[PDB]
Amino acid sequence: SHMRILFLSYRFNSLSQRLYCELTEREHEVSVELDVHPDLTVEAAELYKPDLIIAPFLKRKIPQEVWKKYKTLIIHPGPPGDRGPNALDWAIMKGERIWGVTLLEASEEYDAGDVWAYRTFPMRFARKASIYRNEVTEGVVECVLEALENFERGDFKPTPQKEHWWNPKMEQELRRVDWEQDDTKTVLRKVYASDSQPGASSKVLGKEVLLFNAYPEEELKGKPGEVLALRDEAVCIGTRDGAVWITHMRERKKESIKLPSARVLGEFLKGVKEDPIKPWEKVDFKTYREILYEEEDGIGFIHFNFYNGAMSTEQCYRLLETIKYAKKRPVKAIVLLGSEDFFSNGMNLNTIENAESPADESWRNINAIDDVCEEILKTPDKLTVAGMQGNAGAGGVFLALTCDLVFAREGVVLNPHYKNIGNLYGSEFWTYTLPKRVGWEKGKEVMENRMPISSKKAFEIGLIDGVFGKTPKEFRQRLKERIKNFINSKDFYEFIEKKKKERTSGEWLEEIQKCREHELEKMKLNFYGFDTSYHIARYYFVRRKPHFRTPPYLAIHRRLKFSL
Ligand SMILES: CC(C)(COP(=O)(O)OP(=O)(O)OC[C@H]1O[C@@H](n2cnc3c(N)ncnc32)[C@H](O)[C@@H]1OP(=O)(O)O)[C@@H](O)C(=O)NCCC(=O)NCCS
Ligand SMILES: Nc1nc2c(c(=O)[nH]1)N[C@@H](CNc1ccc(C(=O)N[C@@H](CCC(=O)O)C(=O)O)cc1)CN2
Numbered sequence: 001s002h003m004r005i006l007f008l009s010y011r012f013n014s015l016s017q018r019l020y021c022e023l024t025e026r027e028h029e030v031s032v033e034l035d036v037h038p039d040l041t042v043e044a045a046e047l048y049k050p051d052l053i054i055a056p057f058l059k060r061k062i063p064q065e066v067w068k069k070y071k072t073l074i075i076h077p078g079p080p081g082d083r084g085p086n087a088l089d090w091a092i093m094k095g096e097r098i099w100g101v102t103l104l105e106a107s108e109e110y111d112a113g114d115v116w117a118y119r120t121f122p123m124r125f126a127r128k129a130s131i132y133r134n135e136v137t138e139g140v141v142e143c144v145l146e147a148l149e150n151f152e153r154g155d156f157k158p159t160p161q162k163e164h165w166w167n168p169k170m171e172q173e174l175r176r177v178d179w180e181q182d183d184t185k186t187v188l189r190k191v192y193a194s195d196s197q198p199g200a201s202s203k204v205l206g207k208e209v210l211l212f213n214a215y216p217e218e219e220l221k222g223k224p225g226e227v228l229a230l231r232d233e234a235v236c237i238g239t240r241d242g243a244v245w246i247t248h249m250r251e252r253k254k255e256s257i258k259l260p261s262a263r264v265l266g267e268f269l270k271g272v273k274e275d276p277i278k279p280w281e282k283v284d285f286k287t288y289r290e291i292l293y294e295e296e297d298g299i300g301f302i303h304f305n306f307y308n309g310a311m312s313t314e315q316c317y318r319l320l321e322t323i324k325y326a327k328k329r330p331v332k333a334i335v336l337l338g339s340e341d342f343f344s345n346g347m348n349l350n351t352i353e354n355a356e357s358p359a360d361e362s363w364r365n366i367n368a369i370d371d372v373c374e375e376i377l378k379t380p381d382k383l384t385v386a387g388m389q390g391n392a393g394a395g396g397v398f399l400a401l402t403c404d405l406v407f408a409r410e411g412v413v414l415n416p417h418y419k420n421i422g423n424l425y426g427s428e429f430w431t432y433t434l435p436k437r438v439g440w441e442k443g444k445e446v447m448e449n450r451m452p453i454s455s456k457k458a459f460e461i462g463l464i465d466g467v468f469g470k471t472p473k474e475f476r477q478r479l480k481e482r483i484k485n486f487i488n489s490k491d492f493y494e495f496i497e498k499k500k501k502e503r504t505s506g507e508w509l510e511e512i513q514k515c516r517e518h519e520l521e522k523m524k525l526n527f528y529g530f531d532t533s534y535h536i537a538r539y540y541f542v543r544r545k546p547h548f549r550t551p552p553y554l555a556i557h558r559r560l561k562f563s564l
Pocket of ligand 1: 014391420
């Protein structure tokens with residue numbers, strides 16, 4: 001089995017990238033045609049002539065010319081019989097206790113085809129994006145692998161649907177948060193169902209907005225719709241029975257972008273008081289904690305729940321503060337855990353795009369990230385560990401590589417390159433860390449590859465030190481146990497004595513400083529040089545500008561010397 005597989009995807013999104021990894025790392029070939037026009041889709045099928053078509057993420061109908069000619073399998077993020085374009089939204093709004101995913105054949109009627117495979121799972125009360133990125137994506141991977149085995153077997157017959165139902169596109173009126181009528185549980189459900197798109201509409205301080213990234217608040221109380229506090233740019237708003245934090249909003253205008261709530265509401269918030277909670281404090285009630293520091297068994301764990309993995313200048317400085325605190329604690333190891341869904345996606349391109357000078361903000365942001373990285377590297381007397389529970393891209397990957405040890409959950413997808421953001425040179429001391437791990441030649445290959453790689457592939461090529469665990473929680477438990485065993489071994493004290501000698505030597509310190517200087521001179525050129533590739537790419541990314549063709553790096557069937 002060395003199949004030629006065509007993906008049809010509206011966007012080469014997290015699910016499409018995970019499946020690309022699983023299939024190519026099994027030596028199948030995967031070409032991608034983006035969903036631009038049915039005529040383009042027909043052309044791509046005739047050009048590539050796939051053994052099999054998989055549609056991981058598709059907003060419109062595959063033309064009959066295609067799927068009547070090539071076996072076409074379609075991902076649906078609901079259990080068998082569920083039909084419609086907003087399966088997860090409805091599941092969350094209705095409070096389903098069980099959900100699932102289905103791999104079904106293309107047919108004329110939407111989501112009506114025979115079932116090739118499916119998986120079910122218990123629902124979490126959580127954002128739609130988190131369910132999509134965890135339960136749904138893991139379940140779809142098992143379905144596609146099972147279908148591949150069925151396909152190459154040759155005698156598989158799919159199971160036609162029996163019971164079924166249709167849920168239409170969900171209207172905003174259903175998502176709209178009414179602070180006076182909605183208790184906290186209802187506000188969470190609506191925001192969760194609409195996160196990360198299209199957001200739950202609401203009015204806040206008289207502004208029509210879309211709400212994102214909600215968290216319950218049990219201590220602060222007030223009037224429904226009253227802003228009770230600010231905390232790391234999230235706002236806390238009274239509900240019918242309590243209060244909810246909203247960390248991000250978007251104004252309901254065509255060109256607006258998702259930003260920290262404080263930046264969207266602006267002067268409307270004048271007078272609200274910051275209610276700070278340091279990451280290392282203990283509290284007994286539910287509240288919003290962007291960064292959390294906890295110590296167990298001689299290990300200091302730093303969770304940083306930065307929305308979408310995007311690290312603003314100010315979030316970097318808050319993370320830096322917590323790393324400095326941890327370096328002063330009696331721990332043997334410091335573990336950077338990111339969040340369950342992302343380790344890090346590097347600089348925050350939205351707060352950059354929103355600044356008066358995106359170039360100056362990029363410069364602020366890359367220096368802030370490098371300060372975090374430098375603080376990590378210059379930790380002579382403690383083990384540092386990156387635990388990648390979730391995906392990482394661009395600078396977020398190289399952030400992890402500054403730690404002594406990098407581990408990742410099974411199924412994490414890595415994008416250790418800058419080809420989507422205008423071929424940035426990158427920093428985070430990659431010119432020091434990457435050759436140490438894989439050599440200069442391989443490291444340059446890694447950064448020239450625009451396609452994703454899995455954590456398994458990253459481990460096999462030496463980019464990271466291990467991969468284990470299927471869920472974030474299992475990964476965290478295995479990580480703690482692995483680090484605990486190490487710091488309680490004789491090997492740890494020998495390693496630390498060596499690291500003390502290396503990381504306090506003038507030779508080492510001057511080397512890493514030169515690496516930062518060289519990287520930042522190159523990023524300066526990216527940010528400020530006459531060539532504005534970086535700013536153009538950031539604009540397309542942040543504004544989600546459509547494609548009018550599939551680039552040849554995705555479409556094998558559209559490269560220059562493509563034959564047969
Ligand atoms: C890493 C990457 C390839 C992953 O692709 P993917 O799995 O399809 O994930 P998405 O692009 O859909 O990201 C999910 C969300 O996080 C956003 N996001 C990801 N990285 C971001 C970043 N650095 N800054 C701001 N937003 C980011 C995306 O806009 C998207 O937003 P939305 O769901 O609110 O609509 C892609 O997210 C990416 O290129 N991010 C930018 C990394 C970067 O260039 N950082 C700056 C240089 S250090
Ligand atoms: N051949 C064929 N093509 C398909 C599917 C199929 O089974 N058969 N299933 C699709 C995946 N699931 C859906 C289900 C419903 C809708 C849908 O309802 N679209 C509305 C617009 C809704 C929107 O705004 O997104 C329309 O009028 O086209 C879109 C994708 C992929 N395209």
